[PDB]
Design a protein around this ligand. Sequence first.
Ligand SMILES: O=C(O)c1ccc(Cl)cc1NS(=O)(=O)c1cc(Cl)c(Cl)cc1Cl
Ligand SMILES: O=C(O)c1ccc(Cl)cc1NS(=O)(=O)c1cc(Cl)c(Cl)cc1Cl
Ligand SMILES: [Mn+2]
Ligand SMILES: [Mn+2]
Length: 559
Amino acid sequence: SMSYTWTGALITPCAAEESKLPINPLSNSLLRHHNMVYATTSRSASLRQKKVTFDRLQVLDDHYRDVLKEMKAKASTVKAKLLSIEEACKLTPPHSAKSKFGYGAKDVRNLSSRAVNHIRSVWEDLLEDTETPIDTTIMAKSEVFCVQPRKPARLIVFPDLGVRVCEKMALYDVVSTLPQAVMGSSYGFQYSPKQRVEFLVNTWKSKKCPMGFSYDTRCFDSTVTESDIRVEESIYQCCDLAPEARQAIRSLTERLYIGGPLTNSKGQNCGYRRCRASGVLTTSCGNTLTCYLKATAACRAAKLQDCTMLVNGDDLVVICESAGTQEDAAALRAFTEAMTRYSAPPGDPPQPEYDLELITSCSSNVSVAHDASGKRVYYLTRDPTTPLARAAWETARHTPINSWLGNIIMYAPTLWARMILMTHFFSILLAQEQLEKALDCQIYGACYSIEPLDLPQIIERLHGLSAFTLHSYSPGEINRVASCLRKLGVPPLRTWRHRARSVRAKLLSQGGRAATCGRYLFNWAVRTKLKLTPIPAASQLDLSGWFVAGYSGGDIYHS
Ligand SMILES: O=C(O)c1ccc(Cl)cc1NS(=O)(=O)c1cc(Cl)c(Cl)cc1Cl
Ligand SMILES: O=C(O)c1ccc(Cl)cc1NS(=O)(=O)c1cc(Cl)c(Cl)cc1Cl
Ligand SMILES: [Mn+2]
Ligand SMILES: [Mn+2]
C-alpha cells in the first residue's frame, strides 16, 4: 500500500518559524558564517512528502519467519507491568504539546482533575473501541543544519496528549524491557557511549578477519508496513500482560500504530498514514525490532558469515567474518536485495569496510586516543558540523532542549566537545552567572534535567577519568575537526585553547563545584597538569536508567 495518501491540504505551522541564525555577539564568537546555518520549516514540507510517499514492496520468506519465531521465544520470557495513571503522568515532559481537550503537560504532571479524568476516559475508550482510527497531528519538524555543498524538514506525526499518557500506561514497561530480552547484546540503547565502543571493539577483535558495514534504509519509517507493525505487536503479545494492557496494545496497534488520519495544525484533513508514525511510544522499540528482524534474516539469505548486529532504531551496524574481497562484495549486495524484499531498501548502497574506524552510524564512528599513561583508548566521535551549528543556534535562540549539553555528555572525550563546546558554554554560563541553573537535554530521545556543575561526575561515571586526559588524537579526526571549523567560520583550536585557559582560571577562583569543573574539564588546556583523582560525588551518581532503552519521539521525561 501507499505509505501516505494526501488530500491536498498543506502541512501548516502553528506559530512563526525561524529559519535563519541571528547575528548575535555570543553566537558569533563561536561561529562566524551565520548564513550557513539554517533550520527546517514547513516551507519544505512538500519536498519531504514527495520523498516519503511510495508503494511498498514486501515478500517474506522462511528466514524471516525463522528469525521472528526466535525473537518471539525470547519475548515469551517477559512479564510487563501496567503503569498507573500517576506513573504515566510523571513521565510526561513539562513542555509536551498540550491536549486539545482543555489541559496541558503541566496539568498532567500535577495530576489535575480535568487531565486525569480525560486520560481515564481515553483509556476506557481504548478498552472498548478496537477499530476507530485515532486522530494524529502532522507537523514539519524544526531542526538545525549546515548548508551542504538543504535538507527538507522531517514530518512528525503524533496523537493527542491523552492518548500519549495511555500509551505509557500500556507500553512503557514493554518498550523499556522487551528489546533487551529479545535482541540481547545487539540492542544498542542499553549502552552508554563507552559501552557501545566496548562492544564494537570486542566484536571487531573477535573475528578472524573482520568486515563490517553500516546499512542505511531510505526513510525507514515510510518503509514500515502494516504487516511489520502487526508482527511487532505479535512480539509484544508474547509478554505476560494485564488484561487491560493486552487490549490497550491490541487497540493501539489497530487504531494508531498501523496508521490513521493526518490532521494539520489548522484542523484540516491532510491525508492518511499507512506506515510508522514518528511520534508514538513504540517507534524506537518497534523500529529496532523491525530492523533487527529484517537484517538478521537478510544475513542468512545473503550467506554473510557470523553476522553480529548493533541496532538503534533504524540505524544498523553489522560486523561479520570476511570471506574475501569479492565474496564480501557479492554477499553484501545479496544482503541488500534481501532487505529490499523485506521492504527496507537502502538510501545509498552499503559498502564493506575492513577498518572499524571507517564505519559510520548516525554520523558517529569509533576512533582512538591515549590517556596519561600513553595507553590506547577507544572512544565515540562524530563529524562536529551539526553539533556546532546547533550549539550556535541554541546560543542565539532559547530552545526547550539543549543539544549542546547532550553532546558534551555523550561526546565528552572528543577533541571538539572538550576544546569547543565546554569552553564556549562554560564561558557564557560564567558571564551570565548561571552555572547552577539546571537545563534540559535529551539522551536516546528521553528528556533529562541536568546541572552544568555536575558534568565532571557525570563524565567520570560515563567515560572514566581518561575523558579528562585523552591526548594524541588520530590525524584523521584532527583533520576532520580543523576542516570543519574553517568551513563554518569557527575560530581555530589554538584560539579555543586560549579561551579555555581564561575560562579555567575563572572557574578555579570561584572554588566549589565550579573549581572542580575548571580542574577536570579543562586540565587539557594547561601545561602543568593537575593530579586528577576519582570524584567522590561521581561514584555516588544514580545513572541507572540513562541507557536502558531508546525513546525518540516517545514524549518521555526522566526525573
Ligand atoms: O588504525 C588504528 O589505530 C585504529 C584506531 C581506531 C579504530 Cl576504531 C580502528 C583502527 N584500525 S583497525 O585496524 O580497525 C583496529 C581495530 C581494533 Cl578493534 C583494534 Cl583493537 C586495533 C586496530 Cl589497529
Ligand atoms: O595535547 C594535549 O595535552 C591536549 C589534550 C587534550 C586536548 Cl582536547 C587538547 C590538547 N592540546 S591543545 O594544545 O589544546 C591542541 C590540540 C590539538 Cl589536537 C590542536 Cl589541532 C590544537 C591545540 Cl591548540
Ligand atoms: Mn535513527
Ligand atoms: Mn586502522
